[PDB]
């Protein structure tokens, strides 16, 4: 009869509880305190305009129906008591395909404090949309957003809030960076009210600022192209009595400029506007063709 008292506490706790009714349905407004701990900022896909993130998502609120009194002040319960109480229905406005992990059991945490405060934590991987504007590729900086809020609960029923100071709420781990091509500079939180066809909802916004690294595209495209241009300008020092040599010079450098441009344009997505690598390739192609026409004239 050592565990019978806790069974009695939990039975009295769930005796008379309706998990279809939010706390304070016609009496008050439900206050939810949110927190995000990013365990790894995943890879940023440029052709799909998306990114991956792995977070501990924490939500706290107050339910006056779950007050108890016993030898412990906090009950660290399982992940099956959370399905027998009311939990908020938070969704991500710009999420594409997220997963809530359940290996080996559902990764959820519930702690009830003796005055009625609940802490509810989940571990989940979110795949969100990041609309990018690629004029300055590959020297561009982005602000990838992450907006979440409540589905079906308007502003007069459920409102969100950060649990700590807004500059110290979204916390990114140190080893959590799976970025090969970008660089995470900082975070930026925000809060607002959007309005849709069912009413006005509260939306909590987070911005991650990314800055692309140029060190790969330099060696990939910018240096072979300049080398090809220099090799085209080499031809101006040869003697005109060897016409097939300079002819094969000109035509093969135009051919190599074509192969580098085709092999270079597969890197970035199928955007409909011109970038800065296209301007570089176009001006260099103009220089090689100008050299060839100069050879033709001389």
């Amino acid at each position: 009869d050592n565990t019978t008292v806790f069974t009695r506490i939990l039975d009295r706790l769930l005796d008379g509880y309706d998990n279809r009714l939010r706390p304070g349905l016609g009496e008050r407004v439900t206050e939810v305190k949110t927190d995000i701990f990013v365990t790894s900022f995943g890879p940023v896909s440029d052709h799909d305009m998306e990114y991956t993130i792995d977070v501990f998502f924490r939500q706290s609120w107050k339910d006056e129906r779950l007050k108890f009194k016993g030898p412990m002040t906090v009950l660290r319960l399982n992940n099956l008591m959370a399905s027998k109480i009311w939990t908020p229905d938070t969704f991500f406005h710009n999420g594409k395909k997220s997963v809530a992990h359940n290996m080996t059991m559902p990764n959820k945490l519930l702690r009830i404090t003796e005055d009625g405060t609940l802490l509810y934590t989940m571990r989940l991987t979110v795949r969100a949309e990041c609309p990018m504007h690629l004029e300055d590729f590959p020297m561009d900086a982005h602000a990838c957003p992450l907006k979440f809020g409540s589905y079906a609960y308007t502003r007069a029923e459920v409102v969100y809030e950060w649990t700590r100071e807004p500059a110290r709420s979204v916390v990114v781990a140190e080893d959590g960076s799976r970025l090969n091509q970008y660089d995470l500079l900082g975070q930026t939180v925000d809060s607002g009210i959007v309005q849709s066809s069912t009413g006005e909802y509260v939306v909590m916004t987070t911005h991650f600022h990314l800055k692309r690294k140029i060190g790969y595209f330099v060696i990939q495209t910018y240096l072979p192209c300049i080398m090809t241009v220099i090799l085209s300008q080499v031809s101006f020092w040869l003697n005109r009595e060897s016409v097939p040599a300079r002819t094969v010079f000109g035509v093969t450098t135009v051919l190599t400029m074509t192969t580098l441009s085709i092999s270079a344009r597969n890197s970035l997505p199928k955007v409909a506007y011109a970038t800065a690598m296209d301007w570089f390739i176009a001006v260099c192609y103009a220089f090689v063709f100008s050299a060839l026409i100069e050879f033709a004239t001389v």
Partner: antibody
Amino acid sequence: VQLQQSGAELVKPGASVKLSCTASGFNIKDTYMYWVKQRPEQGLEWIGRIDPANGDTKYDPKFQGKATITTDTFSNTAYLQLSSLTSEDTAVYYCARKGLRWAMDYWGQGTSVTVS
Amino acid sequence: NIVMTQSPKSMSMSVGERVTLSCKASEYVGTYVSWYQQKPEQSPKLLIYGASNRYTGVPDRFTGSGSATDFTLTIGSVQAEDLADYHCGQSYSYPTFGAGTKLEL
């Protein structure tokens, strides 16, 4: 709904003071409690921050090590202890409650602390 | 430490016209700036929270307009009891207030 502070008093330079702020109408374990200091005809200055549910505090770097904020949930009060006073401590001290998108909506009545 | 610079220090105007007060931040404070009103020998009262959200119990003549760095408070058709001190304070980080703004008739 209401915050009641202690009464004004004088204090000798080099002593210690303990100002109190008793909350009525709510439970201090839900919100944060801020302490603000105002000099005559100057701007407001933030002293420190206490989280009564957990117990951790933060202080302004100018007041770090000089002030100590504590709480007592039984009597529903919050205390600010000032030590090693100087002549530049003559000000008005306010006890504020956080709420509605980090706004400090409810303030106290303010105590006048004078150093002779 | 985010500092808030308020402008101007003082403004003298009559009853009935529109008046505007400005507040500027050094760093970024995204719609977390509140506006308080302090009458002589009283405690400050919250007027506007968020950046544009009237507190429950304030008249409709106060209006806030917000951004990432530049904020403004506009009072249209002032009265004889709307003369007080006005402070802008940020809450994105640990809170810091402005210098104040006297309003005289």
